[PDB]
């Protein structure tokens, strides 16, 4: 109610991470079939994720990323001033999620192999008078619907566990610092960063347009009113992860 | 313990049924109660704009409402028919039909909305969260009151279409009567003269679903086993209403 909170991926792999985080949560929230439209969010999430698994090597990207995080925590092993029990517990969480990741099936394989899902995948993507089979499925017992949605979801558990952890640890590393965008513009650079997080006071009536090239990024604040650049000086907070 | 299916017999009714569905979808997502309803709300709004941009929906709906109005005229001055209720139905058709003919181009106000048209084409691409669409993300963090007010203004622009379609579908469904039928070896065929919608009731017990196809005034219903997608070839009892 005071500040708009934005996140911006700084590279294509992080843009996939954030997109998958969003779909996993959407399918999870939609999987109670509590309202008679929630199935629409559920299936569209599932099918958007499958499309992603075809076009990127997500499992190996995420394995390597979790190895990078582990290494940053292992540098604090046996350091007097760091809680060794907390640290070891986190390192154990990492190799459990990474191990699960490594022995996992091809992402979206069990989804692609499900007869019912494929049979509707193409047409779902183009209400159910043109999908009689989906309409029949929506008419099954709520226990049955929930069971099937849970089976489909269990197949993404290695991905979900790994991504959830990576993101949690990545967000941890960001410290919010005060910045000013004089006349609506800010630029800076970051070595090896994946995510920008912005906190912007709502009073300004602005949203950020962010772009980047190599390690540099540029934030332009646009008035919501007209979609045009805001010339006012914008005080905001920025965490770079 | 009955599976209820509706099939449009022509491309106009196809659109009618799509719009009915999108209208309810935007309406139920309108309260922004869950963090993900806004997805259903804006997808529906934009799917409607798409649908309009392709077909003479106002003209087809007006004529259909006029046809319904003709049908009631076998009820005026009939012994034991409540003329108060009848005159009210006739008036309601008239008001809804006047509103519809008087309406602005469908979807025009949505197209002319600065915020909507700024997110429309990015919105319509493969989609999952809002790091992509910061204007949308800003909008989602406006007070709930303001979001609902914006949502209700956008929906109100569709109100003449919604009233007309809701009324025509209500009256078309009420005049269809379910008659027991039989698809011996999983196949049924008949012919619908002037019909728009097939309404089927299939016992849950068969684990079948209907494939329906059409030619001129004829339609065919072939049942498929949901478990293996294969053609069912046994006697299927069901109720059929042609509307």
From Swiss-Prot, chain A:
Keywords, comma-separated and alphabetical: Cell cycle, Cell division, Cytoplasm, Septation
GO biological process: division septum assembly; FtsZ-dependent cytokinesis
SUPFAM superfamilies to which the protein is assigned, alphabetical: YacF-like (SSF160950)
InterPro entries: ZapD, ZapD_C, ZapD_sf
Location in or out of the cell: Cytoplasm
Entry annotated with the keyword Cytoplasm: yes
Listed GO CC annotations: cell division site; cytoplasm
Matches recorded under HAMAP family: ZapD
Family indicated by similarity: Belongs to the ZapD family.
UniProt subunit comment: Interacts with FtsZ.
Chain's role: Cell division factor that enhances FtsZ-ring assembly. Directly interacts with FtsZ and promotes bundling of FtsZ protofilaments, with a reduction in FtsZ GTPase activity.
Protein name, UniProt field: Cell division protein ZapD
Organism: Vibrio parahaemolyticus serotype O3:K6 (strain RIMD 2210633)
């Amino acid at each position: 109610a005071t500040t708009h909170k934005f996140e911006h991926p700084l590279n294509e792999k992080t843009r996939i991470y954030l997109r998958v985080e969003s779909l996993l949560r959407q399918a999870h929230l939609a999987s109670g079939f509590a309202d008679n439209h929630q199935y629409q969010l559920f299936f569209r999430a599932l099918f958007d994720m499958v499309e992603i698994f075809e076009q990127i090597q997500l499992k190996s990207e995420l394995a390597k990323d979790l190895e990078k995080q582990r290494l940053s925590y292992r540098h604090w092993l046996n350091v007097e001033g760091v809680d060794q029990e907390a640290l070891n517990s986190l390192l154990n969480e990492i190799d459990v999620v990474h191990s699960q990741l490594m022995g996992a099936e091809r992402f979206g394989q069990a989804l692609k192999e499900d007869r019912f899902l494929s049979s509707i995948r193409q047409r779902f993507n183009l209400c159910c008078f043109d999908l009689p089979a989906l309409h029949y499925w929506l008419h099954l017992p709520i226990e049955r619907k929930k069971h099937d949605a849970n089976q489909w979801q269990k197949s993404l558990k290695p991905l979900s566990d790994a991504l959830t952890l990576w993101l949690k640890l990545a967000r941890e590393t960001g410290h919010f610092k005060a910045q000013i965008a004089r006349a609506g513009f800010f630029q800076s650079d970051a070595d090896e960063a994946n995510i920008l997080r912005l906190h912007i006071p709502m009073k300004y009536g602005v949203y950020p347009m962010i772009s980047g090239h190599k390690n540099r990024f540029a934030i332009k604040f646009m008035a919501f009113e007209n979609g045009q650049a805001c010339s006012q000086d914008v005080e905001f907070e920025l965490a770079v992860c």
